[PDB]
Amino acid sequence: EGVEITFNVNDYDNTLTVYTTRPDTFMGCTYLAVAAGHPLAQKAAENNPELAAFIDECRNTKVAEAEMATMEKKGVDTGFKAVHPLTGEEIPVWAANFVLMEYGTGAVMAVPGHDQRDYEFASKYGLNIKPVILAADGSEPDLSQQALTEKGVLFNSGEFNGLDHEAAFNAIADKLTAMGVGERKV
Numbered sequence: 001e002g003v004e005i006t007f008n009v010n011d012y013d014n015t016l017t018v019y020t021t022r023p024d025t026f027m028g029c030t031y032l033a034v035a036a037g038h039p040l041a042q043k044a045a046e047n048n049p050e051l052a053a054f055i056d057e058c059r060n061t062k063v064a065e066a067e068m069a070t071m072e073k074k075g076v077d078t079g080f081k082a083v084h085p086l087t088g089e090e091i092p093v094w095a096a097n098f099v100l101m102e103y104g105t106g107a108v109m110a111v112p113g114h115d116q117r118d119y120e121f122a123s124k125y126g127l128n129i130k131p132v133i134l135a136a137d138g139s140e141p142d143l144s145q146q147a148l149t150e151k152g153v154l155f156n157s158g159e160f161n162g163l164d165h166e167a168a169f170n171a172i173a174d175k176l177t178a179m180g181v182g183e184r185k186v
Ligand SMILES: CC[C@H](C)[C@H](N)C(=O)O
Pocket: 019, 020, 021, 022, 025, 108, 109, 110, 111, 114, 115, 118
């Protein structure tokens, strides 16, 4: 059980679509990461040589999902900005070597505040780390060294503040659904 979420991207004729099994974290999404072979990625490589080198480097490294906690994560700003449906604010789209096309939509929503891969990528590239889940003792999570991975009560998540994990999941899934931007998957 997960949700597909569809973002609008400024100066781009298509939409961006992500899949996540953690919609409860959605208010902590601070950027999007697309696979180097994603249509958005090449449309931006058109006016970007750095991206052209990266996409080529990537077309070489057949990265394996299972070898990923081992490989050096690498990525490049696509220049495109996506609009967070609930928040309305702008979030960078990056192209990353750890996102593949073969399985999924080829784009992931990232919450560095609460996914370890997301934290490590955002640390390296000075991307924003937003806390949205509270520590088990009900305090603010310590995000100075690593991501808080635990499931828990949302804060700093606007209307979804105070919901435990299973409530958050549904409340955010239902919102994005009713907004015609999200879709549950069995
Ligand atoms: C906290 C988990 C994060 C959001 C991860 N990128 C996912 O969407 O599965």
